[PDB]
Amino acid sequence: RDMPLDSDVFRVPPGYNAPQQVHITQGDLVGRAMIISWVTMDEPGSSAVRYWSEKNGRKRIAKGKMSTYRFFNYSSGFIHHTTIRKLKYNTKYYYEVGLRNTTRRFSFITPPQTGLDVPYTFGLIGDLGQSFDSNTTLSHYELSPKKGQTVLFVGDLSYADRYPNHDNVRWDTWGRFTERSVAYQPWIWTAGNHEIEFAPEINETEPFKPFSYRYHVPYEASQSTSPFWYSIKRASAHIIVLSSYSAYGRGTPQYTWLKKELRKVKRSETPWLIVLMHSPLYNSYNHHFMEGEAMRTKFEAWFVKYKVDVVFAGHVHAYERSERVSNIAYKITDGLCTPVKDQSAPVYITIGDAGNYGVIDSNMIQPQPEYSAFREASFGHGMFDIKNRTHAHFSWNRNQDGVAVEADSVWFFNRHWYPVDDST
Amino acid sequence: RDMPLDSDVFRVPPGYNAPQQVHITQGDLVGRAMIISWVTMDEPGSSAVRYWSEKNGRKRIAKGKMSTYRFFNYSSGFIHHTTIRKLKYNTKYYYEVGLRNTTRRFSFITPPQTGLDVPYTFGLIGDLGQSFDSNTTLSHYELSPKKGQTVLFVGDLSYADRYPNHDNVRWDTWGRFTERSVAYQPWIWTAGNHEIEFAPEINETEPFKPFSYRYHVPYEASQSTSPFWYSIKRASAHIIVLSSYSAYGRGTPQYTWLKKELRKVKRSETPWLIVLMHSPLYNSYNHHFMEGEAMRTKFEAWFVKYKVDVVFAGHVHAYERSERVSNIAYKITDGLCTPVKDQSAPVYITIGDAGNYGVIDSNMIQPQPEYSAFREASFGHGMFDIKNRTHAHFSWNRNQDGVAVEADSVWFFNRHWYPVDDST
Numbered sequence: 001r002d003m004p005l006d007s008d009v010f011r012v013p014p015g016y017n018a019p020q021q022v023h024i025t026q027g028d029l030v031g032r033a034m035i036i037s038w039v040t041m042d043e044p045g046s047s048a049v050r051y052w053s054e055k056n057g058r059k060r061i062a063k064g065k066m067s068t069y070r071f072f073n074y075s076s077g078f079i080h081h082t083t084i085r086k087l088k089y090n091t092k093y094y095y096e097v098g099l100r101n102t103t104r105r106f107s108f109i110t111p112p113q114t115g116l117d118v119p120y121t122f123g124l125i126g127d128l129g130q131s132f133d134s135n136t137t138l139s140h141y142e143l144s145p146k147k148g149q150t151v152l153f154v155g156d157l158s159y160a161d162r163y164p165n166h167d168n169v170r171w172d173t174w175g176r177f178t179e180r181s182v183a184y185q186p187w188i189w190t191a192g193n194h195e196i197e198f199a200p201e202i203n204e205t206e207p208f209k210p211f212s213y214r215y216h217v218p219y220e221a222s223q224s225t226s227p228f229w230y231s232i233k234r235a236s237a238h239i240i241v242l243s244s245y246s247a248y249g250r251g252t253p254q255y256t257w258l259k260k261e262l263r264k265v266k267r268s269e270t271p272w273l274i275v276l277m278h279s280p281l282y283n284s285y286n287h288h289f290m291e292g293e294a295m296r297t298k299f300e301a302w303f304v305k306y307k308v309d310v311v312f313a314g315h316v317h318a319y320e321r322s323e324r325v326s327n328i329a330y331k332i333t334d335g336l337c338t339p340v341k342d343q344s345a346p347v348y349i350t351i352g353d354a355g356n357y358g359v360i361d362s363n364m365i366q367p368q369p370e371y372s373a374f375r376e377a378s379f380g381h382g383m384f385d386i387k388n389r390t391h392a393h394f395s396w397n398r399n400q401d402g403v404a405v406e407a408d409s410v411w412f413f414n415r416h417w418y419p420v421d422d423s424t
Numbered sequence: 425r426d427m428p429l430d431s432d433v434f435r436v437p438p439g440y441n442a443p444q445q446v447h448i449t450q451g452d453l454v455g456r457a458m459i460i461s462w463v464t465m466d467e468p469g470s471s472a473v474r475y476w477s478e479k480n481g482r483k484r485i486a487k488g489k490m491s492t493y494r495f496f497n498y499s500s501g502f503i504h505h506t507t508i509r510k511l512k513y514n515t516k517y518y519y520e521v522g523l524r525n526t527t528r529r530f531s532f533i534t535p536p537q538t539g540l541d542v543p544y545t546f547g548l549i550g551d552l553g554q555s556f557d558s559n560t561t562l563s564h565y566e567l568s569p570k571k572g573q574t575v576l577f578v579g580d581l582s583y584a585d586r587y588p589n590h591d592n593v594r595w596d597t598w599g600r601f602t603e604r605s606v607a608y609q610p611w612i613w614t615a616g617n618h619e620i621e622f623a624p625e626i627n628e629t630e631p632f633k634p635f636s637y638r639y640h641v642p643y644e645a646s647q648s649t650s651p652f653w654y655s656i657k658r659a660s661a662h663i664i665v666l667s668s669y670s671a672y673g674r675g676t677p678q679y680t681w682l683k684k685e686l687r688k689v690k691r692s693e694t695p696w697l698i699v700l701m702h703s704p705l706y707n708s709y710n711h712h713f714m715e716g717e718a719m720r721t722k723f724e725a726w727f728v729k730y731k732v733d734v735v736f737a738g739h740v741h742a743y744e745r746s747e748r749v750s751n752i753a754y755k756i757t758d759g760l761c762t763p764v765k766d767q768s769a770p771v772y773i774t775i776g777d778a779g780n781y782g783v784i785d786s787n788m789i790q791p792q793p794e795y796s797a798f799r800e801a802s803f804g805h806g807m808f809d810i811k812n813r814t815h816a817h818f819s820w821n822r823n824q825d826g827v828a829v830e831a832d833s834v835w836f837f838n839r840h841w842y843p844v845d846d847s848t
């Protein structure tokens with residue numbers, strides 16, 4: 001069900017060496033930097049970026065770096081990544097890319113300065129892919145009346161690896177597909193399993209290669225030593241991104257980083273604490289049932305302990321929401337291995353239903369267990385609308401519904417400022 | 425309690441550019457290849473190795489490769505790794521190293537050809553370190569009347585990382601310390617946590633660096649894409665080595681490899697199936713209690729399913745033995761989260777009590793749970809003496825005891841050829 005190559009959506013911007021696949025993300029820790037990334041296919045081109053604010057039209061230039069990679073019998077075009085920095089908060093910015101030959105203009109708006117009661121609305125999309133369904137989700141999100149300002153991307157980007165030799169063209173199509181959204185608003189990236197691409201047979205054995213060349217993150221802004229896990233503060237939220245397919249052993253770098261990072265969170269500054277990951281820790285569908293177990297046995301307590309608000313995952317092509325629940329009592333022989341409501345525990349939501357290759361996971365465990373608050377096998381996206389330091393309203397729009405129909409909806413009470421039972 | 429630098433044990437072989445830190449390991453999948461590794465400190469030197477069999481004294485030469493690494497303000501000497509191959513089975517071999525200036529002679533014996541009833545005796549040492557205690561273990565093993573022929577090394581080699589800036593000299597001392605054993609009989613290597621050495625502060629952030637330069641394994645012989653996990657067949661046993669601090673997510677390379685590898689095991693050819701890892705899956709001591717949980721939730725079933733015989737780990741500086749037990753029934757809400765005797769499950773033994781920096785873990789969970797068959801906080805090593813395709817006799821010598829005193833002893837009944845209850 002993957003949109004074919006001719007698809008209008010996959011069309012290449014006209015012009016010799018026309019910057020295609022333009023896509024941006026947060027470039028620093030708190031909001032005043034952007035990473036502009038694009039691809040030129042005719043010849044290398046200039047990695048410079050021209051930008052200026054709407055108000056003070058003083059045009060400035062930032063210079064980036066260009067790279068290329070080979071996959072198997074594939075060869076990338078020229079990939080460029082430039083980082084504009086020291087932007088002013090809350091400001092529309094105009095940036096042009098492709099200065100040497102055919103220039104393309106775009107705009108993005110710096111977010112507000114980090115704050116206790118600074119509202120912001122994130123869209124949640126995970127497991128996008130490039131089926132027609134995916135097209136639909138992307139448009140539903142594009143139209144949600146409460147308009148999203150940043151997309152938290154929970155993993156599995158293009159499924160190019162389903163194609164033979166992971167036909168990296170499918171990475172180029174996807175890049176072009178999603179441009180309409182990403183060239184204007186950042187998408188926070190999360191490594192999914194489809195990103196791994198461990199292909200020994202074709203002699204590709206460096207995990208996350210194509211992904212890593214195409215998508216960059218300010219991992220160094222947190223003090224991560226790897227792009228596969230990092231964090232960003234934006235508006236009022238503090239976002240930690242983890243890697244299910246990287247390592248979390250005790251003492252390993254991801255483990256070491258997450259621990260320290262959790263201690264660096266300041267709720268007085270960023271009331272909302274959100275965590276992202278691909279494989280979900282709490283899941284009641286049959287598909288991938290219990291994979292999150294390992295990472296669960298490692299990070300749950302921390303999450304409960306620091307009172308993280310929500311945890312979004314993908315990986316299960318469907319939707320599900322949970323009760324604020326923990327299960328941190330088991331000690332092997334003591335039999336306390338059953339999830340209990342705990343109000344310090346986060347609400348685990350899974351939204352890997354944005355489309356993939358057009359297939360939904362419907363087989364679920366009968367009957368819906370206590371921990372599971374609401375679950376449905378439909379394609380859709382989500383929105384997490386932060387209001388105050390106490391309120392944030394999550395929503396779930398189904399692809400079947402009209403753009404403004406909230407198939408599911410929930411008010412989040414800040415685990416830190418207003419810990420009242422938001423459970424139902 | 426770490427033996428000081430002057431220690432006779434740490435002495436440098438006399439001679440200009442005298443090959444020091446000589447140490448060998450299996451170089452192929454089935455036994456007819458050796459990897460000779462040494463270090464020259466004065467100048468690069470020749471990476472050639474001269475070898476010949478006792479019988480046919482036709483001296484041959486194998487050429488290796490030389491490398492060096494810098495750690496922080498440290499700089500290795502010249503490390504050499506040469507692989508002699510196509511050796512004859514069961515044959516004493518003589519090899520000389522350091523041909524250009526001061527040559528040193530050693531010998532090793534190829535093992536017997538892989539077989540159903542081929543006996544062999546492995547020594548188990550884990551968590552060695554370089555305290556006086558360590559010295560003692562090494563000697564106890566050196567004297568065990570049933571003489572070991574290969575040492576299965578369960579992780580944590582030298583604890584150089586306890587020193588400041590991980591003073592890599594301590595890696596050089598350890599290398600010299602253990603030479604008396606390793607230059608003559610292979611030690612199968614397992615990455616321990618102390619091997620990770622993730623030191624961002626001193627700008628060292630590549631996991632396992634010093635370890636990886638100094639110790640090499642025939643990972644490519646299995647079809648591993650990383651030295652951190654591999655397998656070797658020797659005598660009658662099939663040995664799988666895993667990495668607790670590498671990644672095991674579903675789809676990750678280690679995960680992918682272990683699965684396939686387990687399918688490649690032929691019990692009709694190698695009756696004994698042994699698995700190595702550092703962090704133990706079943707552990708009743710307080711120290712590191714429940715760390716193996718994650719990797720457990722991922723590989724246990726496989727082990728039960730393939731009927732692996734034993735699983736050795738280190739990490740807990742003490743000793744413990746278990747009942748053939750599984751705990752593969754939990755499905756979250758069903759409460760079946762308690763270990764039961766299962767005769768298809770392996771016996772999990774932990775021997776991280778070879779010495780470390782001279783400290784034993786004694787705090788254990790009271791009372792000793794059902795799954796735990798025998799546990800004690802003493803320094804020691806182990807021997808796993810394979811007899812037939814049905815019998816193998818494990819033993820545990822305490823450092824307090826005399827060389828031939830088996831503080832613990834157990835007969836192993838082959839999970840495949842003779843699955844009778846060896847439990848007690």
Ligand SMILES: *[C@@H]1O[C@H](CO)[C@@H](O)[C@H](O)[C@H]1NC(C)=O
Nearest residue numbers: 072073074075164165167169
């Ligand atoms: C890559 O190889 C496949 C067959 O192995 C072939 O069909 C395909 O067209 C090739 N692609 C390129 C860009 O050469």
Ligand SMILES: *[C@@H]1O[C@H](CO)[C@@H](O)[C@H](O)[C@H]1NC(C)=O
Nearest residue numbers: 016017042043099100101102
């Ligand atoms: C591209 O830009 C260069 C320099 O601006 C110019 O000389 C060249 O002719 C342009 N057109 C093409 C097709 O390269």
Ligand SMILES: *[C@@H]1O[C@H](CO)[C@@H](O)[C@H](O)[C@H]1NC(C)=O
Nearest residue numbers: 003007008009132135136139
């Ligand atoms: C994708 O959706 C856009 C609008 O949402 C539409 O203009 C376009 O034709 C669609 N293309 C496909 C292949 O669905």
Ligand SMILES: *[C@@H]1O[C@H](CO)[C@@H](O)[C@H](O)[C@H]1NC(C)=O
Nearest residue numbers: 199200201202203204205647
């Ligand atoms: C490439 O193809 C397969 C993958 O394992 C193998 O036969 C071959 O050795 C691989 N590597 C090279 C360098 O050809």
Ligand SMILES: *[C@@H]1O[C@H](CO)[C@@H](O)[C@H](O)[C@H]1NC(C)=O
Nearest residue numbers: 387388389390391392393411
């Ligand atoms: C939080 O927002 C809700 C509506 O979402 C509102 O009713 C409530 O009074 C707000 N709290 C503050 C402190 O303004």
Ligand SMILES: *[C@@H]1O[C@H](CO)[C@@H](O)[C@H](O)[C@H]1NC(C)=O
Nearest residue numbers: 496497498499588589591593
């Ligand atoms: C490395 O630095 C430490 C202090 O940072 C110093 O005491 C030590 O002697 C140095 N080692 C070398 C080999 O320079």
Ligand SMILES: *[C@@H]1O[C@H](CO)[C@@H](O)[C@H](O)[C@H]1NC(C)=O
Nearest residue numbers: 440441466467523524525526
């Ligand atoms: C080492 O060997 C070389 C060549 O065999 C020789 O010329 C040299 O003088 C020897 N001695 C030293 C100290 O290098």
Ligand SMILES: *[C@@H]1O[C@H](CO)[C@@H](O)[C@H](O)[C@H]1NC(C)=O
Nearest residue numbers: 427431432433556559560563
């Ligand atoms: C280590 O043990 C050996 C024999 O086992 C002995 O000769 C040596 O002196 C000992 N050294 C230390 C520092 O214990």
Ligand SMILES: *[C@@H]1O[C@H](CO)[C@@H](O)[C@H](O)[C@H]1NC(C)=O
Nearest residue numbers: 223623624625626627628629
């Ligand atoms: C080296 O020391 C610390 C480690 O994080 C840091 O201050 C510095 O930036 C590091 N890197 C370099 C290149 O100095």
Ligand SMILES: *[C@@H]1O[C@H](CO)[C@@H](O)[C@H](O)[C@H]1NC(C)=O
Nearest residue numbers: 811812813814815816817835
């Ligand atoms: C296995 O070895 C034991 C002693 O360890 C012996 O009693 C038994 O008969 C042997 N089995 C075979 C088939 O020889």
Ligand SMILES: [Fe+3]
Nearest residue numbers: 127156315356
């Ligand atoms: Fe997916």
Ligand SMILES: [Fe+3]
Nearest residue numbers: 551580739780
């Ligand atoms: Fe240890």
Ligand SMILES: [Zn+2]
Nearest residue numbers: 156192193315
């Ligand atoms: Zn997935």
Ligand SMILES: [Zn+2]
Nearest residue numbers: 580616617739
């Ligand atoms: Zn350890």
